[PDB]
Every structure is written in structure tokens, then in C-alpha cells.
Amino acid sequence: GSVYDAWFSCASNQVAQVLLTLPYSFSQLGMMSGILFQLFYGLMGSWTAYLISVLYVEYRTRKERENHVIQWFEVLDGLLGKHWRNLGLIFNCTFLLFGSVIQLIACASNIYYINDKLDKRTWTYIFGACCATTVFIPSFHNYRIWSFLGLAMTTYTSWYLTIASLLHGQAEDVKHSGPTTMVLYFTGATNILYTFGGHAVTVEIMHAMWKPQKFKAIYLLATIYVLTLTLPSASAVYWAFGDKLLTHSNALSLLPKTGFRDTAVILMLIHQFITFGFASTPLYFVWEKLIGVFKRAMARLPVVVPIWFLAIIFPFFGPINSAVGSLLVSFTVYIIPALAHMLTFAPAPSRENAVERPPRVVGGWMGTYCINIFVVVWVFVVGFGFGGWASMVNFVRQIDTFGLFTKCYQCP
């Protein structure tokens, strides 16, 4: 519950499986573009985390003026009308569902690389069956105390990727094509957008804190550490391997098979299972609320059926990240929080009586509003329009190439 616990939670939650697909995005963007996009989207994610923190603090203070777990849709209801609550709930639930699908696909892809006898689709079957047991757990929340473990797995995997890439060097056939076409560039930009943001579960972690008013610096440090992890691994992998990453979205596929790779795969699988549980628990909560409900185990069974069907039908490890990042994340973690922050404080009485004043360095309310407008416009233009179009055209291209219900997606 202390500051360190919150930092560990919000640093381990930042990247779970996208760490492997980042070099794939670099294969489309390049070095300079990739690094710039990573830094810019890390700053944007930190800013949106601060916006969510101030919104949650205002809502909690207003509620206290006149236990349970405070969720994002509840905060939106408290600070605005019911239509805002409906929009936030729908977008958050859809994003969490697709994120759970992504984490299951990543688990199947990772497990495929330590036991190649079984294709990736059978691994998806078995991992869906195994993760169906997540319904039994009452709530994966309040168990986040073991987040330092996941942070250790993430940092070890990143440093292993960096070291292995540096040791492997470059072959004579390595060619850094760079930004070949706009579609791939925007798909990579959308993937980097997805990599950061907090994933609409920032409020859940922030609730545990004794004093949530200091979440801004904690999230800033967590995201700067996550950047320090992401930049070297992706940079090394790209510089070493080059355009060959397009045909292999998963970084571990290209690296030589060794004990270190097996340990990294196992640790990433454990981390992805934990992250899937964390992301699916809110869906179970919402389903329980809607349906009116150890009987909960069978009530939550229909919740995992959509996840299982989406993983098998669309096992694309790379393109799915961009699709979710453009269609859902761009509105769930980047636009909705900013719009809510702008609207709640738009009235003068609300702005004057704000519980926490805007940061002095930014420039007060004017600077905060300007940054919110910039965030909204940028995420809507590059994160949704161009990013969404590029991601979806890439997705349909992959559907046409590998087919539907593809077996061992990218299994050369």
C-alpha cells in the first residue's frame, strides 16, 4: 500500500507481452522514429495517468465530503453524467476483453517456442483451458503485492533480449530497410501507442495507496523505468536483426534457442498469465454486476468464452496489438480521460474549488487544457484515423495471407 508497492504495481503492469513485439514495430519504424515515438508516448501515458489520478482524487474527495473498490466508470459517474459512465464502462470492458485475448495469444506464442512439437493453435487450446481456472479466484486484485516478481521477470527478459542481440551481432544479409511504407509505419506507431498508457487499470492500483495524491511522481518514475527497459531491448534487437523482424513478430523466435531463452519464455508466460488474470478480473466484476450475482465460477464461465474464440480465430501476435491499440486504447486510455478532465473542470466553480491545483511548471489550468487538447487531437488523428486505418488494413492483409483460424501463425 506504500509508495513502493504502487510503483512496483504500475511499473510491472506497463509492459507484459508487448515487450516481445516492440522490435517488430521497430522493424517498421526504424531507430530514430521508434525512439522518438516511444519517448513521446511514454510522456503521453504519464500525462494521462496524472489526469486519471487528479480525476480520481477529486471524485474521492467529493464522495468523502458527504469498504469497496473504486473503478474508472464509477469515477466518471461521480464527476459527470450517466452517459459518461456508460461510455467509459463500455470502452474499458471492451479494451480489457481484447487485452486478455492479446495476453492469451502471447502466452500461446511464447509456449510454442519451448515445445515445438505442438502447433500454436493446440497451445492456445490448452492455455485457454488452463486460464479458464481464473474464474475460480475471487479477485486477482489485492494480490498485487507480488508485483515485484513480475517486474523482475520483465526487466530480466528485456536485459536478456539486449544482451543476446548484442552478442549475436549482425549477419551479412542484414538490411535495415526502414520506413518502407506508410501502412507499416502507422502500425508500428499504433503498437508503440498501445505499449504505454496504464491500460485503464491505473485507478485500481491507485485505490490501494494510503495517499493517492502522490501517484503522479510514482507513475512518472515507473514509466521512465519502463522506457529504460524497452528502449535498449528493442533497439538492440532491431539493430542486430533488421528487416527480418517483419516475418517474425515475436522477438524470441529469431534468437537462438538456449537455456536463457527458455527461462525468459517461462518467466514471460508466468507474467502474462498473471496479467491476464489481472485484466480479466474487472470483466468478471462487471459481468457479476450485470447478471445480478462457489457459484461465481460458472457465472464467469461465459465471460472467458469470447476470449477463447477470439484467440483461436485471430492468433496474430503482432497485428492484433496494433488493432487493439488503435480501435480501443486510443479511446480508453488516451482520449476519454483527457475529455473527462477537460469537462469536469470546465465550469469556473469546479476549477476554482479544485482539490489539487495543476502543476506550476505546466502553466496552470491554461497549460493543462492545452496539453489535453493536444493529446486528444494527436490520439484522434494518428492514434485512431491513420493508425486505425493502417492497423486494420494490415490485419486484413494478414487474414488474407495466413488465412482464418491459422495454425502455427508464423511457424517457418
Ligand SMILES: O=C(O)COc1ccc(Cl)cc1Cl
Ligand atoms: O501487453 C501490454 O502491453 C499490456 O497488457 C495489459 C496489461 C494489463 C492490463 Cl489490465 C491490460 C493489458 Cl491490455
